Design an enzyme around this catalytic site. Structure first.
Site, short mmCIF file in Angstrom:
data_model
loop_
_atom_site.label_atom_id
_atom_site.label_comp_id
_atom_site.label_asym_id
_atom_site.label_seq_id
_atom_site.Cartn_x
_atom_site.Cartn_y
_atom_site.Cartn_z
N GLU A 1 0.81 -1.19 0.00
CA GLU A 1 0.00 0.00 0.00
C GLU A 1 0.85 1.25 0.00
OE1 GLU A 1 -3.25 0.04 -0.29
OE2 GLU A 1 -3.76 -1.98 0.45
N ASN B 1 -9.16 7.44 -5.67
CA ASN B 1 -9.91 6.37 -6.29
C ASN B 1 -10.98 6.90 -7.25
OD1 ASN B 1 -8.90 3.67 -5.27
ND2 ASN B 1 -9.11 4.76 -3.33
N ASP C 1 -14.98 6.10 -7.18
CA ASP C 1 -15.96 6.73 -6.31
C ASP C 1 -15.40 8.04 -5.79
OD1 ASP C 1 -14.03 6.03 -4.27
OD2 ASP C 1 -15.30 4.54 -3.47
N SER D 1 -12.98 8.60 -3.89
CA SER D 1 -12.43 8.58 -2.57
C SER D 1 -10.92 8.65 -2.68
CB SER D 1 -12.89 7.29 -1.87
OG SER D 1 -12.24 6.15 -2.42
N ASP E 1 -7.26 7.40 -0.56
CA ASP E 1 -6.63 6.53 0.41
C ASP E 1 -5.47 7.25 0.98
OD1 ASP E 1 -8.27 4.00 -0.07
OD2 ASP E 1 -7.17 4.06 -1.95
N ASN F 1 -9.03 4.50 3.60
CA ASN F 1 -9.95 5.16 2.69
C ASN F 1 -10.87 6.16 3.38
OD1 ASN F 1 -12.77 5.09 1.30
ND2 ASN F 1 -11.30 4.92 -0.40
CL LIG Z 1 -14.89 9.68 0.16
#
Ligand SMILES: [Cl-]
Length: 130
Positions: free
Chosen positions: A35, A46, A49, A51, A53, A60
């Site tokens: 990661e 991401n 959606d 989002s 990380d 997230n």
């Molecule tokens: Cl989010």
């Protein structure tokens, strides 16, 4: 900040992650490696959606921290996402314990399934003597 593998491993060691909810140091390290490369300031958008990380464990934003963006996200670890981008990693880790307190445990991370499950993880601890 970027940790040297064994520095991290021992710091997590000192912070109670070894065996926490069944997850060994080695698993945590493999997780961390894939990661983040042991980097507290690592990010990832991401596109799927929208989002994002955060940090060494790529937590997230949709559900685990707050970054202001999506007005329907939750922040279950009750910290700004930014506190996941710092050198001291206690917050990360706390939030990391909370996620593995969910029943799925560390299998919540996709990179853990593809990179560490049923694979070699000792390697990530080799020579650290923890
Ligand atoms: Cl989010």
């Amino acid at each position: 900040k970027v940790f040297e593998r064994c520095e991290l491993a021992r710091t997590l060691k000192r912070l109670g992650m070894d065996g926490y909810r069944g997850i060994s140091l080695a698993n945590w390290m493999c997780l961390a490696k894939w990661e983040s490369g042991y980097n507290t300031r690592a990010t990832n958008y991401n596109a799927g959606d929208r989002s994002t990380d955060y940090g060494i464990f790529q937590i997230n934003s949709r559900y685990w921290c707050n970054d202001g963006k999506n007005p329907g996200a939750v922040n279950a670890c009750h910290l700004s996402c930014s506190a996941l981008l710092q050198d001291n990693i206690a917050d990360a880790v706390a939030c990391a314990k909370r996620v593995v307190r969910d029943p799925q445990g560390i299998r919540a991370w996709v990179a853990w399934r593809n990179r560490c499950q049923n694979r070699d993880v000792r390697q990530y601890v080799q020579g650290c003597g923890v």
